[PDB]
Design a protein around this ligand. Structure first.
Ligand SMILES: Nc1nc2c(ncn2[C@@H]2O[C@H](COP(=O)(O)OP(=O)(O)OP(=O)(O)O)[C@@H](O)[C@H]2O)c(=O)[nH]1
Length: 158
């Protein structure tokens, strides 16, 4: 369904009650992003979200509240140099649903090492638009729309 070259994907914005969001550092790199990942066949976006929430951040439902979610896809294109044309299903980009999670269990529960090959090796609380300012350029349009979609809810926690 909707085989359009864009891989179904779900991203996570974790917030606290001070208008900050959790920013994660890609393993062995100095680039940062929100947790994201593919939605597997048969999974709802919410189910994929909770799976990657634990795989990438070590958090489960008891640690968070889903405050909001986006209903429609936000799409971004890979840089042409990064497209893998011989690996099916070929994707030229990702189409993302996004979830807004309040962390309610405390910072110590974040655990990015639930695997021997972790996605991330560090995290920071950052100001609300800092992800828009710092994310790789080809995700910036999506990040703007995600953060704006979630802004009123995040502010309501302060
Ligand atoms: N230099 C640089 N490259 C990035 C950055 N983020 C993603 N990339 C590269 O862009 C390509 C696409 O990245 P993503 O769209 O995040 O997809 P992915 O990480 O391969 O797959 P998922 O984590 O499952 O969503 C990957 O090959 C990354 O190496 C970044 O912040 N800096």
């Amino acid at each position: 369904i909707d085989d359009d070259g864009y891989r179904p994907n779900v991203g996570i914005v974790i917030c606290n009650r001070q208008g900050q969001v959790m920013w994660a550092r890609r393993f062995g790199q100095h680039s940062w992003q929100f947790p994201q990942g593919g939605i597997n066949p048969g999974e709802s976006a919410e189910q994929a979200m909770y799976r990657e929430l634990f795989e990438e951040v070590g958090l489960s439902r008891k640690d968070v509240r889903i405050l909001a979610s986006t209903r429609n896809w936000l799409r971004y294109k890979l840089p042409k140099r990064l497209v893998r044309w011989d690996t099916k299903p070929v994707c030229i980009g990702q189409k993302q649903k996004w979830f807004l999670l309040q962390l309610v269990s405390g910072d110590a529960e974040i655990n990015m090492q639930t695997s021997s090959t972790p996605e991330f090796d560090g995290w920071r609380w950052v100001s609300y638009w800092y992800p828009v300012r710092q994310v790789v350029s080809f995700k910036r349009d999506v990040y703007r729309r995600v953060m704006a979609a979630f802004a009123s809810v995040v502010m309501s926690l302060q």
